[PDB]
Structure formats: C-alpha cells, structure tokens
Amino acid sequence: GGAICAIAVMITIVMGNGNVRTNQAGLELIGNAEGCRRDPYMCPAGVWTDGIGNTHGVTPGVRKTDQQIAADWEKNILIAERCINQHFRGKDMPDNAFSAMTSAAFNMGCNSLRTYYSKARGMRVETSIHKWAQKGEWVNMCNHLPDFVNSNGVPLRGLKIRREKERQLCLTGLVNEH
After folding, report:
1. Domain limits of the chain?
2. 43 is a catalytic site residue
3. Residue 125 pairs with which residues in a beta bridge?
4. Chain discontinuities in the chain, listed by preceding residue (C to N exceeding 2.5 Å)
5. Topology at the third CATH level for domain 1-178
6. Under 8 Å CB-to-CB from 41, ≥6 apart: which residues?
7. Is 170 marked active-site?
C-alpha cells in the first residue's frame, strides 16, 4: 500500500529547485526526524501536520501531491535558513554547519535559538550558541547544539539524539574527521 511518501524523492525536488542551501545530509537529517506522510496526522497539543513536519495549509483528510509536499517542505526550510542567515551569520559559515543550524531552527524555531529565559536574571538573554555564531566561532557554536533538548521544560531523549546528529553534521569538515 501507500500512505507514506519518500523523503529521498522530496530531497531531489527541493535540491533541484535551487533555492535551498542546506545540503543533502541536512535534508536527510530533517526528513528522517519528521518522516513523510500524505495523510494529515495529530501531534500532542493537537494541530494537524502534513508531509514532512508541515503545519501550514493543512486540512484533515486532504491528501497532498508529491510535489505539493516538497513545495511545503521547501517553504519551511527557507524560513529556517532565513533565521540562520539573519541571526547567526549563516552566510559566513560553511555548508555543513549551516545545514545543521537550519535543521535546529526548523525544529525549534528561531526565537528559541536566539534567546532563553534566565530564571536567575528574570528575563530573556542571548544564548551562547548565538554569541559564538556572531563571533564566527563555528566549532564552539556547533558544540552548543545539545543545549536545546527541552520541550515544555523537559528534556527529550529524541531531542538529545537529534541535537547530537546535528552537532556531528555541523562539525564535519571543521575538526579531524577521525
């Protein structure tokens, strides 16, 4: 049967369009985290989801094109890429770091990468990952990806795993591959 769609096929379309910078490894990382579904489904705190983690333009029971789901994915990727470019010096970092960062922003949203609420200081303050990004210190930046593993103030095994996959990507080509 068929309800699950192919990430690999979505990757070739998005890469073919020539808009997204994030590389194959980044699209693979993002795609496998989310999975790919033509049928809209319900996540906790239920709001409908499409394709590859898409929640915009989603109508229950409405099955999307293969190309429409790539279109959707592209759009969400470019939002995440804008975050990295506008706020983390994306234009200056290499592709692997950029792609890992994009994956983080796709998942957590830009706001959560830029600042966090300091209970000590009683206000939101700049993150270390942003500090290191602005300094062009990519290795240090990458190595802060594991800071972002909480949901509703609780760490998730899945987010630990994800942030570590992102960190490994971020750093390839930046450190001894062995």
Report:
1. 1-178
2. yes
3. 116
4. none
5. Lysozyme (1.10.530)
6. 48, 49
7. no
